[PDB]
Amino acid sequence: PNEPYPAWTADSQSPVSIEQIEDIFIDLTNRLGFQRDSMRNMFDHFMVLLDSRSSRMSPDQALLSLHADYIGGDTANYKKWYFAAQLDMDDEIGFRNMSLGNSLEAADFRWKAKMNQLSPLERVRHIALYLLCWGEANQVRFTAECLCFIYKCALDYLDSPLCQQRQEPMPEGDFLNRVITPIYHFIRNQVYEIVDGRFVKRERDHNKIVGYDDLNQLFWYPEGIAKIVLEDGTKLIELPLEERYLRLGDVVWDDVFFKTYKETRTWLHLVTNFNRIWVMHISIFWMYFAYNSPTFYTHNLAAYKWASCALGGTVASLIQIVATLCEWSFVPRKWAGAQHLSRRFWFLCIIFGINLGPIIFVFAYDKDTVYSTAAHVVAAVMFFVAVATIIFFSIMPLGGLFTSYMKKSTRRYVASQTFTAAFAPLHGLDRWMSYLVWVTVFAAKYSESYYFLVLSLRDPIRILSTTAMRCTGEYWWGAVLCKVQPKIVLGLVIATDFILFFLDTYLWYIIVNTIFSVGKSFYLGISILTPWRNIFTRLPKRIYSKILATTDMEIKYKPKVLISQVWNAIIISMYREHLLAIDHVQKLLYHQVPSEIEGKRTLRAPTFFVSQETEFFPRDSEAERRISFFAQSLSTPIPEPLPVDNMPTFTVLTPHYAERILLSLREIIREDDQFSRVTLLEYLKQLHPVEWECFVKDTKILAEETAAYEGNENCIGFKSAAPEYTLRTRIWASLRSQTLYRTISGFMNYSRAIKLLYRVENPEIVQMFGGNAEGLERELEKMARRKFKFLVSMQRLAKFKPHELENAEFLLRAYPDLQIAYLDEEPPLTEGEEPRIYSALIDGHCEILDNGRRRPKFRVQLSGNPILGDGKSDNQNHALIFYRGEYIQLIDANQDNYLEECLKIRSVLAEFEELNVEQVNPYAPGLRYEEQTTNHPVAIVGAREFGTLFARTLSQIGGKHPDFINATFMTTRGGVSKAQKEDIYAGMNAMLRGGRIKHCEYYQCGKGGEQMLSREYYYLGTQLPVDRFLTFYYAHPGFHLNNLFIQLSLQMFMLTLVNLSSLAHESIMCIYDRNKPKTDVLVPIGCYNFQPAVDWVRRYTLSIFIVFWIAFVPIVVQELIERGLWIPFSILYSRFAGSAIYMGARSMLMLLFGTVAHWQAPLLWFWASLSSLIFAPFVFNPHQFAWEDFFLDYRDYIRWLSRGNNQYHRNSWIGYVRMSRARITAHRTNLIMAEIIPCAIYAAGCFIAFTFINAQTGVKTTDDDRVNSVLRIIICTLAPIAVNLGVLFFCMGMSCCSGPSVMAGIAHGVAVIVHIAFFIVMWVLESFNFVRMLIGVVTCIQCQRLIFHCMTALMLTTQPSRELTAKVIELSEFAADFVLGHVILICQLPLIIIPKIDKFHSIMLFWLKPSRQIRPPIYSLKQTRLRKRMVKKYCSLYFLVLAIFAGCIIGPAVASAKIHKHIGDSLDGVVHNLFQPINTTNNDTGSQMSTY
């Protein structure tokens, strides 16, 4: 060989010589002025692609395949763009896609013929032009279609006679400075700004930003192309094709581009994109509810039953219309698709009318009066039409719902189908399996839901719909609310069940996926019950079959020898890692000790394989787990390998920013005269003591250096001051600790594995060298360098420290093969100009300059700084231009890899489905799109990993990061990563574009909210097939929405429980046993039995417990290390305040009201859950076992409250309420009101429960005797705020002159005192009954929250008034926070009371992973006495506050017990303000026939 690209160079059949490729690249550079160094880099890139592609096929076939992949083939992004924009065939492509699940065929035939006519030199020219444009694109690489348009213009320019006529070469760098630079400037200006000659960041709502995608989308549609206008005003389209490339620089972009996808409130997105879920769930729930409520649709009839159910279809049509309106909101009207939205709305309204008509006919009371069989049949047929409508709207995707019928002249689809709807269909038994899984899920879900609905709500609906109560009621409307009280309870119950109806589906989805996974495991046959001895026994033959490509090579040697060499390399790797003992390694090694003269004595099978009991592996060693996993992986079916020389070339990409390259000697060893923690070297030693001890004690390093051959048959530091020893310690520490160097070594194991495979498979090379070990090593290294390339990106190298530069130089010295990519900067030629920034690449081969910096092999100039936005994606983008090969592996800064995982690299690459397939001409005239099998490439590949149950749960948590990438596919489309600020976005872009994603279990790698608005979510939800859509929805967003629904159902249940407890308390109930007949005379005469309602409460508690348990199994499963056998207080509270701490406390208060009103066992479970929710942070945090610690934390909390009163402080309560207000801070105003509405509902519900309590149910009706409870609520709600306003005004305008922080704290304390006083006044008004007061105070809190939210909403839409409102809200918030923290500390008191909780703290320490000890420094006696004085002071004050509150609670009860209740002298409309009766019978029963 001896050529840079042996495969293409050596073959005499190659159609184009390397010199011709160089010449054509140079010609393109001359004509378009690409950077010479960029031209060289892309020439190297193209030659490497040809070498890799030709290594596994004929040269001309390789070039043809490259042309097809990049521009000509149906898998080429350029073809898709050309048909979408120049030929305007997007709707026809949507037609074709729908069918698969002049005219397009004619245009495709013309395109194929045109491609076929091309000669090889022309194909090379096309590919080279594209590669040069791509290399120069820089930031435009993310906007791939813009790059395609620029490429089209470049081709038109080149082929024109005008370009050929010119004899003067274009100036170097013309492309970058003229075409790319304006677009980069546009992108940069849309984010940043300049001030005082310094570049500053500018922030705006993402709706106002024009990001990469919005820039990209303009090129999809021909109309978007037409919007481009030059500076002088002429449209770019008017110019002939040959002139366009030159005029491109003259264009102005700011006014051309625009925003395509506009974002608004989250719930609008959820309604639009996930419309099918809502349609199916809500419609079926209505149909179930209609079928089971005779009273609602029966006066005081089967036709009414059937008709009422048909309303389900009407609900579905309504959901569709609402979704359509939201969709109309999202996209701008001028952009293509608005007319389709109008037509779709028209069709949906027509369907709605059709569904409504017959139902209105049946509803007509005159038609009912004279019963007609015609009405009955109409009702039945309407029901079936409604079921058909529900099915139709649940199945069909919203996007292009009626498109097929229209055949409209305009663009039929809203979103370009070529780039948004090209999903690869599932093929074979896989698609049927998906259908069956989802059918199973929904069948089980609906069956279970109907069982539960009928069982739980068949009785309660009857009772609560037909039962009427007896009370005097409030003065204003006394009669009207008791008669509907059970109806309100029933409505709340139905709402709660409606919410639960959604959680059921996710539960069933998890269950069914678990069952299907177990089924797949059975089909595969891999069973844990299978002895590991058998798997190890079979391992050698499996290695022979799979890890080595033996069928390809001639069978001239026994398999035993080859597998022995592979295993010996593996075990020597293990030994070099020191994870195995020398004797253990000897037992695990194919022994050559016996004489080599006898073949049997030459090779001896390992004791480890033959024996299987003995401790072959050290217990709890990473090596043993790695070997076991290797065997397990070999058990599974994996694709056949291919010879190394035939393997494709791939590259490994690693970015990092501030990561630690290598462990510093200072880190390992520290000064003697200091004391802090434990020395890190000793800490690591404790982590792996045996591994550390073995190699130092036995000199295992040199012994393993000798064993690897196995006869060839296979003053800083006090303890030591030897440089080589220092290097050894640093290397060991870097290996055993998170470090970039560890990843670099683990991935150089790729090159080691490739070298090993090439040596093993081809003994002919070894014979040819004939003992020339150095030459053999050189040749194998040539192969390894040819096939595998490692690239690590460092944007920091220009700003590296001296020690970091030394570490990088050491890294390069260790591995000369390695490659690095970094950025460097230079000043401009003209003064008053931006600096020039280049991207450079260095590898170990580059010679070292005099100044010590390594010479750059390639320099590429970028129009501006590549890091436009803070993200890893730009770091990768500025460096990937240097990638080589057909496949890319992505890893983050820190990862670990091993030789065994590297051996299987050939298999991993094979699963991209390119290596083992036969090759055909992609331009044959006969072939048709439908017949082709290469339509959907493999864009991305992911790598993944009593006992059976744990495997099930591990699979559960596993199910849901691209670890490999098809270089060409992702390079032509968008970028390798498109965060454009994450991996999920890149994967979803690949899925949308048309590629596939595969997962492999034979390769494992170790690594150690806003999405809802994304356009990609909208496209996926609006255009996916129904089964694919369900898969996607319940994978990614289902989890978030399920958690949100759990919280919502908790709140709804608390509201329903409050109302139901009030109803049970004020009423008199009657119970019955199961043996006692179902229908019988009521045990007390004139009683309403609500026992089924509390039974519903029990059922709901069980349901929520099940859902919570299922949601929590993954979290406990994640703690596999524990296995089945097993701090600033104020900062923590603020951290979890607003994170369900306030909601937790409010729900705890409602639950306490329910508990005192009525007692049911299920409420105990809710009590436990809420207590856990509130106290979890305060139990799992450390330092809890100390009274002094608690008093210090309490002092810090009191300081936090006090800080900011006089002088603003960031760590203060004022600052945190300010932060909350800032985070809260026309049509959008309506959307804001939309969120305020639910708070109004909750306030109304609590108020209604409070009114129930005071209605005086069982008391004899008294004419004109009524209680004004609503006035009670009004007074108790207004009084605190009114007093706050009054004291604020007093402070503002009074006593300011008499000056001699205390004042602001006084105002806060006064507000707190007034809140407490008004709670006391409420308790007094209730006549000292505790339960009525509890519900009253809950309602008062809800009303205050509603008022504050209304004020905030008004503020979001005079300045002194606004500031006054903000201050008032903040005062109320201080009161709430102070009382909450006070009760928190009360609950803390009992823990402090215990003399010694050291046992609990020790158990907690054992549970905690870090397991770290800290000790305080010494203190002076005077300072210690000051600390003790502070402890005494603050504990005394804390107990004083606690006693004040405890008296405030108990003392009023004692006083009320001492002083008998009395009411008198209530007039002027305000009657019995204080709750009317001191005594009350509240028991109406018996009374013979009469009741009440």
Partner 1 sequence: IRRKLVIVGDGACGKTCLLIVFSKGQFPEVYVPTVFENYVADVEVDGRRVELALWDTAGHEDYDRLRPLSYPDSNVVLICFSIDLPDSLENVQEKWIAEVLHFCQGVPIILVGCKVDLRNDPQTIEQLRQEGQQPVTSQEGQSVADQIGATGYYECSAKTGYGVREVFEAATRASLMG
Residues at the interface with partner 1 (CB under 8 A):
196-198, 658, 671, 674, 676, 799, 801-802, 870, 1207-1211
Instruction: Report how far residue 1281's alpha carbon sits from residue 1372's, in angstroms, rounded to the nearest whole number.
Output: 8
Instruction: Report how far residue 263's alpha carbon sits from residue 1358's, in angstroms, rounded to the nearest whole number.
Output: 31
Instruction: Report how far residue 1283's alpha carbon sits from residue 1278's, in angstroms, rounded to the nearest whole number.
Output: 9
1344 CB burial (10 A radius; 0-12, 13-18, 19+): buried
Helix (H) or strand (E) holding 305: helix 302-330
Strand partners, 887: 650, 966
CB 544 within 8 A of CB 562: yes
CA atoms within 13 A on the CB side of 842: 21
**Buried residues in 799-831 as b, exposed as e (16+ CB within 10 A):** eeeeebeebbbebbebbebbbbbbbeeeeeeee
The CB-of-812 to partner 1 minimum distance in angstroms stands at: 22
Q: Which is nearer to partner 1, 193 or 1235 (CB)?
A: 193
Q: Which of 1361, 1068, 1261 is nearest to 471 (CA)?
A: 1261
Instruction: Report how far residue 917's alpha carbon sits from residue 933's, in angstroms, rounded to the nearest whole number.
Output: 11
To 5 degrees, how large is the angle CA 879–CA 882–CA 887? Answer: 100
Q: Which is nearer to partner 1, 428 or 802 (CB)?
A: 802
The CB-of-676 to partner 1 minimum distance in angstroms stands at: 7
Q: Which is nearer to partner 1, 1204 or 1336 (CB)?
A: 1204
The CB-of-561 to partner 1 minimum distance in angstroms stands at: 52
Q: What does the radius of gyration of the chain's CA atoms come to, in whole angstroms?
A: 38
Residue 120 has φ and ψ, to the nearest 5°, of -55, -40
Q: Provide the residue type at 278 as one letter.
A: W
Q: What Å distances lie between residue 1444 and 789, 851, 1386, 1437, 1447, CA to CA?
A: 74, 75, 12, 10, 5
Residue 842 has φ and ψ, to the nearest 5°, of -135, 145
Give start and end residues of each alpha helix (H) in 364-420.
365-369, 373-395, 403-406, 417-420
Residue 1152 has φ and ψ, to the nearest 5°, of -65, -40
The CB-of-658 to partner 1 minimum distance in angstroms stands at: 5
Q: Which is nearer to partner 1, 799 or 999 (CB)?
A: 799
Q: Which is nearer to partner 1, 997 or 1366 (CB)?
A: 1366
Spell out where 1111-1217 has E strands: none
CB 1191 within 8 A of CB 1437: no
Structure tokens at 444: 């089980």
Structure tokens at 1133: 């509270």
Structure tokens at 1195: 């002092």
Question: Token match 């406390």: residue?
Answer: 1145
Q: How far apart are the first and last CA of the chain?
A: 109
Structure tokens at 1416: 């305080």
Q: Which is nearer to partner 1, 595 or 1207 (CB)?
A: 1207
Instruction: Report how far residue 1052's alpha carbon sits from residue 1066's, in angstroms, rounded to the nearest whole number.
Output: 21
Instruction: Report how far residue 986's alpha carbon sits from residue 978's, in angstroms, rounded to the nearest whole number.
Output: 6
Q: Which is nearer to partner 1, 1210 or 1432 (CB)?
A: 1210
The CB-of-225 to partner 1 minimum distance in angstroms stands at: 40
Longest CA–CA separation in the chain, Å:
122
Q: Which is nearer to partner 1, 110 or 1210 (CB)?
A: 1210
Q: Provide the residue type at 1264 as one letter.
A: D
Structure tokens at 1201: 């409250």
Q: Which is nearer to partner 1, 41 or 795 (CB)?
A: 795
Q: Which is nearer to partner 1, 829 or 1418 (CB)?
A: 1418
3-state secondary structure of 1026: helix
The CB-of-392 to partner 1 minimum distance in angstroms stands at: 53
Q: Which is nearer to partner 1, 799 or 813 (CB)?
A: 799
The CB-of-723 to partner 1 minimum distance in angstroms stands at: 20
Q: Which is nearer to partner 1, 448 or 806 (CB)?
A: 806
The CB-of-321 to partner 1 minimum distance in angstroms stands at: 47
The CB-of-804 to partner 1 minimum distance in angstroms stands at: 10
The CB-of-808 to partner 1 minimum distance in angstroms stands at: 16
Structure tokens at 526: 């891999």
DSSP string, 1051-1093: HHHHHHHHHHHHHHHHS------SSS-SS---SSTT----HHH
The CB-of-185 to partner 1 minimum distance in angstroms stands at: 22
Instruction: Report how far residue 140's alpha carbon sits from residue 1133's, in angstroms, rounded to the nearest whole number.
Output: 46
CB 943 within 8 A of CB 931: no
Strand partners, 656: 794
CB 641 within 8 A of CB 1016: no
Instruction: Report how far residue 582's alpha carbon sits from residue 572's, in angstroms, rounded to the nearest whole number.
Output: 10
Q: Provide the residue type at 1432 as one letter.
A: K
The CB-of-674 to partner 1 minimum distance in angstroms stands at: 6
